[PDB]
Amino acid sequence: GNPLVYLDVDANGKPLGRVVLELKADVVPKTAENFRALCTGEKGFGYKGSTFHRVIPSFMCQAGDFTNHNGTGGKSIYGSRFPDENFTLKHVGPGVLSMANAGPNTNGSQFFICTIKTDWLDGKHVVFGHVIEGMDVVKKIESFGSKSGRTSKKIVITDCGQLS
Numbered sequence: 001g002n003p004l005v006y007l008d009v010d011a012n013g014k015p016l017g018r019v020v021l022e023l024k025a026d027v028v029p030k031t032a033e034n035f036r037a038l039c040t041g042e043k044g045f046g047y048k049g050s051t052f053h054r055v056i057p058s059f060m061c062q063a064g065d066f067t068n069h070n071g072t073g074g075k076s077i078y079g080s081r082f083p084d085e086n087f088t089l090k091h092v093g094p095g096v097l098s099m100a101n102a103g104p105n106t107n108g109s110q111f112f113i114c115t116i117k118t119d120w121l122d123g124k125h126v127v128f129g130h131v132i133e134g135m136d137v138v139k140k141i142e143s144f145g146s147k148s149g150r151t152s153k154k155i156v157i158t159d160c161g162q163l164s
């Protein structure tokens, strides 16, 4: 079946709660596996201790640059980049989990959680899961963003892992 993973998120060193994500290994196994392993940290690196670096209200919350912490970095469990697996899943609404990229076939570790339907990203960003619970925590994160993407508090994934 599909993995269930979690992100525990702080704002300025104080807990916001837990986001639980289903990873659609049934549709995008390579993309799901990358995220799963970055949550557990089992390859020796991952999301623990990294930030939501770009948060745009009424759009999405972006994270996963655990190398440069500024939106330029991150890496996959396979290497520095990996191909777009498929575009079967669509950006249908709030809670969609999708890969950030620098154009075709540049998936690394950066990802975003949508807070609206972002259907204009269909065919460009690989969707690979969704929020199961903790959408209220995603809304808390969203509230510290701005149209520029700059956050008013430092938003950190303090812990993350796999539930099943």
Ligand SMILES: CSc1ccccc1[C@H]1CCCN1C(=O)CNC(=O)NCc1ccc2c(c1)[C@H]1C[C@@H](N2)[C@H](O)CO1
Binding pocket: 060, 062, 071, 072, 073, 074, 075, 080, 081, 099, 100, 101, 102, 106, 107, 108, 109, 110, 112
């Ligand atoms: C910025 S609002 C926005 C507006 C329109 C479309 C998309 C976006 C936003 C919101 C949703 C996702 N997203 C974007 O994806 C923007 N694009 C980046 O932020 N790109 C940085 C980025 C991503 C992945 C990777 C690297 C660098 C590095 C490391 C490794 N992966 C590879 O090797 C390539 O270089």
